[PDB]
Symmetry: C4
């Protein structure tokens, strides 16, 4: 199917939509945000929303409602986004501007401790960093009190990379969801703790506004207090990691996944080590914030 972009279902799943900005939209966007380097976006957070406005305005204001419709739709909730003409590591700054503009049409990206900024870039080259190790499926933000509504993962560079696809699991594609959701431990608050902060307690499952399951789970930060919790969690982990509903999604340079962190889990497949390997990623995580017609008190 829009003004300034096209939208088509992915080859991995009808739940994941691919949104591509047209060449003209991309050139006009880059022109109109040229006066702010990424460093200005880092220092003045209102500029993150301003570049969002510029991009949405170039799409006849059709972009923001579509992003929101898609991310909040339980049947979908995931986008793979790119702009024609932004597809090489030399354009890293333009990539950051684009992902920033999209994210701040639907919410606000949170401070990232790994970078000290609202986004983090990191390069993979040359236990947790083992190429043969899958990064298991999980939700972000489980070790703080506030809810993380979205995860954004952008491929900045890729050289001599075999494997390393993003892994995704939509809870409604997870055949064994009801088995674990209906267990009493599904709704028991457990301790979550970050590595070097104060521990938080919340269950690994919750519900959305309609009573449907959502998840706040990661194997590294959950801290079972006893043998009962620990054995159950290892069984949950196994059931998630072996689910036949998992998607394996290549993320080419210049594209980014933008997913609803409440009912999508994400991870990363193993990849083959190689001396000339280079992979560069950028991430943002944040909360949704958007207008709706709803009730308020006083004047």
């Amino acid at each position: 199917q829009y003004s300034g972009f096209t939208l088509t279902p992915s080859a991995q799943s009808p739940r994941l939509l691919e949104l591509t900005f047209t060449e003209q939209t991309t050139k006009q966007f880059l022109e109109q945000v040229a006066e702010w380097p990424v460093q200005a976006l880092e220092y003045k957070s209102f500029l993150r929303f301003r570049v969002a406005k510029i991009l949405d305005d170039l799409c006849a204001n059709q972009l923001q409602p579509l992003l929101l419709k898609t991310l909040l739709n339980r049947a979908e909730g995931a986008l793979l986004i790119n702009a024609v003409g932004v597809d090489d590591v030399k354009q890293a700054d333009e990539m950051v501007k684009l992902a920033t503009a999209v994210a701040h049409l639907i919410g606000r990206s949170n401070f990232d401790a790994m970078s000290g900024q609202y986004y983090a870039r990191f390069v993979v080259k040359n236990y947790l960093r083992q190429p043969h190790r899958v990064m298991e499926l999980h939700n972000d933000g489980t070790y703080v009190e506030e809810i993380t509504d979205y995860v954004l993962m952008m491929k900045i560079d890729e050289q001599n990379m075999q494997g390393g696809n993003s892994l995704l699991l939509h809870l409604d594609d997870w055949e064994h969801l009801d088995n674990y959701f209906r267990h009493p431990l599904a709704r028991r608050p457990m301790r979550f703790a970050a590595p070097p902060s104060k521990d938080v307690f919340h269950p690994v499952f919750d519900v959305d506004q309609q009573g449907r399951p959502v998840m706040r789970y990661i194997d590294q930060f959950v801290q079972p207090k006893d043998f009962e919790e620990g054995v159950w969690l290892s069984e949950l982990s196994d059931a998630i990691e072996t689910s036949k509903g998992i998607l394996s999604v290549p993320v080419p340079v210049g594209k980014f996944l933008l997913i609803n962190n409440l009912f999508w889990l994400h991870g990363r497949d193993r990849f083959t080590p190689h001396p000339d390997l280079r992979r560069e990623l950028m991430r943002q995580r944040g909360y949704f914030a958007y207008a709706s017609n709803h009730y308020q008190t006083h004047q």
Copy 2:
């Protein structure tokens, strides 16, 4: 128009008054504060008020009421101050003593994290530090709970400097003030956050004791929570930065601006880079504290 000093309106604005201590007052002041090095003022804060008393006493006690009258007068609220005979970088310590004496007749200067002292000196030579970048107009102290009532900015040294004037904007010279003040977002508490502390919430506009607008705004530390706040703030920023009411004030070596931080914004113009450039500044920020005839309870 005083005993020990003269006071005349600036060439940039009738709101900014220029106060010059006479040669005799300056020599007597330096004589009478010679027994305390700046290092004693740093270690014993009562001495900051004592050098204030000495300076005011040399002006027949006319200085303190005039400083207060001027700073608290909504129609003015800004002073450019100097002392005849203190005008060269070699006299940096005498400059610090003079600015200290003036500041502590009207209030108290707060701890400065950049220096670990009640004042900070810094040298500019050789993104935020780009000579071509204007430092946008703002208020100080927006990221703490307590109100900063005054900002003091002193030129200690200037060599091979082209440009770099202090910028000032009195809210009552700002033609578009009412447009932004009457918007609901003007009085919504927003998040303010310092870089490396705990976040504070306050609106960007408030009122003085008479209901007239005051401001607590800086583009770097305000953290709009969503697209609505962020777009509005970018529009406010633009309206402030393009105001025809902005003053451009040269601050020669040995002079200092002392302004009411509630209804003056301040900034700094771009300057031309030059290999032999040297600029040295000193700042103090603090709250007003002064006697008035007003009510009290008990005995």
Copy 3:
């Protein structure tokens, strides 16, 4: 006297039982936990309970009840544990897996600040570290609010070691217990403070669920507030250190002590310095967590 292990009283005391896993159990255990390196146990705490399940399952589920029966039995409360075939420093990782599996059948091991992990390994070679100095008998965990129920001390390596036995004192072997327990200072809360955290207050004696004495004492961290407390504590220290009930227990490589920290004190004897000396230890400390038939409210 079991399926997969044998259990016999020690030569030092009928209160200390020696539990040895059979060669077959050990080989099957190591096979079935081979897919998780120690580093996976460090990163995913649910795996600590999973290796526990694997070991207990290989003992026909007789291991967990026996561990609990022994540790909670006031008449015993201490185990010396080993597995046939795990007895050389090269098998340090297998040792860590074994001690982890045992500990997490009965509870959960707490974060260790010395290592940043749920266990700590340290090597002794080449005032507190004086070989001629006895480490006095004490309880662990006295400087935090939560109770430490068990201490686990494993010998990873021993070369050219003369002396250095573990010292143990069961409160019911301590002839002078009643003398100190019946003193008013026994139940006065005193200050306990760790070295580089917030001070805690608790008495040096308490009672178990049956009203029998337990202890939370260490000479280094207790902080008598005055001459009365300090003199009494020095007398208590002397009475403990000279008790005829103290056990001196060699801990050969691959064996570990697992003791109930409420009514056993532990320490370490002096040893002879030697240029080629090498001793490697591993410790875990934690709380008990186990199922029992007891009352609950609501549904």
Copy 4:
């Protein structure tokens, strides 16, 4: 005038008593505390009280009541203490043991941030550290909530030292006490702040249990909030520093002053710089803790 020591008024003041332990008492003390190095006293605070008991026992238990009588006597409140045979820098450890024993008969010495121990030693050799600068009279402990009851200052070493006497001022020798005590600012809580912690508020004067003035004052840490407080404090400072009641007390190697910090101020005179100068000091500060016949509730 005792068993094991002699007590005589100083040459500077009848308020300062000189207490000297006899040669025999000192030898027996050093013998009986030889089994604990200073390092054991650092690690086990109950040993600080135990060496106190040993010293008091060698004085037929006459020492502790006399120390307390003297320190709590408003007419005196200050001791200069030494032991015959302890008088050379090589005996620094014996000096520390002696001062520890005396201090912990009357109270408990607090943690010292400068050393990380209950006492601090520091060496002077080769603004605040200017030999020509007097350290002004003050009370210790003004920047924390708890009251510091005693200050202990011991001379460990002195070589090529001219000047540098301890300065002391007993509030009842201070002729202008009533002038400042009867001023409203005497009892206004002011802010006190340490350098690199949380600010405390208390007045500079208080009263003892009989309503007589005591002081909690230091010029460096008190933070007058305005011109009124700052000018008054500078006048108080001047009145204290120029008091004709100030004592100038030499502290020879091996002697220590032990003073009641509530109604004695202390300081240090200037000294002449010299290339071969060496001065070593040890300090302890703490609270009183002692038995009295007074009321209690419950049983």
